């Protein structure tokens, strides 16, 4: 079973497909992070001429000062509409499908060949502070959830994609992955996105190394299948809830 990203745009049809095992369980699809508690930059690229645009030159490419510092451009970029460094904002995500794996739950797979260092998807969710994080830890333990969706963003910001997020919440862990996190500044705010680290052939599952900070009493077994698998999500050590959440 597999589905494409447009299948998640219609909640009623999605909920029906989920009841027949054709889509994962319903969640609230969001376009950007939602803060439970709200908290308290133009590059120097020379604008492309119309002829350079027509000949295929890239605006705000590899030499863009903002891109080099993992900062996206705004609407006021000197290249305006042509700026290629607004991928998070313009939802310029990779062509990926959501698939059912044999025993990891649902996962993500490439629907085309993905070049190295291709933006896949932003990891969106509800952003929690430490107090809200502990409340959700308790709730998900009481609910006996199997899958966990917490991503550390910065000191007192944990992204929780359990209830609200996007298809990035389906990326599974691998001990030998083909994607990574990158933290990007968008409008003075930090976001996390997934990016390939190598050429990913069409049909391949997309994975990243969770570097999981496990507070649970027991670690989940890892089924990534890599020759150098660590055996468990969390590895050897158990950490406290407070350390896992950024202390």
């Amino acid at each position: 079973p597999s589905c494409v990203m447009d299948d998640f745009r219609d909640p009623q049809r999605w909920k029906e497909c989920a009841k027949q095992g054709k889509m994962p369980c319903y969640f609230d699809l969001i376009e950007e992070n939602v803060y439970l508690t709200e908290r308290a930059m133009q590059c120097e690229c020379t604008p492309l001429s119309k002829d350079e645009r027509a000949q295929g030159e890239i605006a705000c490419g590899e030499d863009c000062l903002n891109r080099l510092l993992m900062i996206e451009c705004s609407s006021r970029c000197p290249n305006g509409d042509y700026c290629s460094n607004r991928r998070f904002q313009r939802k310029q995500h990779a062509d990926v499908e959501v698939i059912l794996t044999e025993k990891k739950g649902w996962g993500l797979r490439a629907a085309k060949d993905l070049p190295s260092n291709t933006f896949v998807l932003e990891y969106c969710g509800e952003v929690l502070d430490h107090k809200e994080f502990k409340a959700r830890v308790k709730e998900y333990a009481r609910n006996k959830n199997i899958h966990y969706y917490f991503m550390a963003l910065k000191n007192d910001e944990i992204i929780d994609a359990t209830q609200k997020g996007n298809c990035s919440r389906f990326m599974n862990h691998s001990c030998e992955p083909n994607c990574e996190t990158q933290k990007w500044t968008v409008n003075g705010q930090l976001r996390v996105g997934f990016f390939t680290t190598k050429l990913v052939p069409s049909g391949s599952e997309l994975t990243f190394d969770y570097q999981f900070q496990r507070y649970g009493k027991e670690a989940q077994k890892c089924f990534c299948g890599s020759a150098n698998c660590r055996g468990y999500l969390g590895g050897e050590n158990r950490v406290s809830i407070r350390a896992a959440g950024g202390k």
């Binding site: 830890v137 308790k138 998900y140 333990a141 959830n145 199997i146 966990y148 917490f150 991503m151 550390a152 963003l153 944990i158 992955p177 994607c179 990574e180 996190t181 990158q182 933290k183 996390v192 680290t197 990243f208 190394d209 969770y210 570097q211 999981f212 900070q213 496990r214 507070y215 649970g216 009493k217 027991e218 989940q220 999500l233 969390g234 950490v239 809830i241 896992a244 959440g245 950024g246």
Partner: peptide, 14 residues
């Protein structure tokens, strides 16, 4: 003491 759970930690792939 939850039986299961943890937090994913961003890092640059090495």
């Amino acid at each position: 003491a939850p039986s299961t759970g943890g937090v994913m930690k961003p890092h640059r792939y090495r």
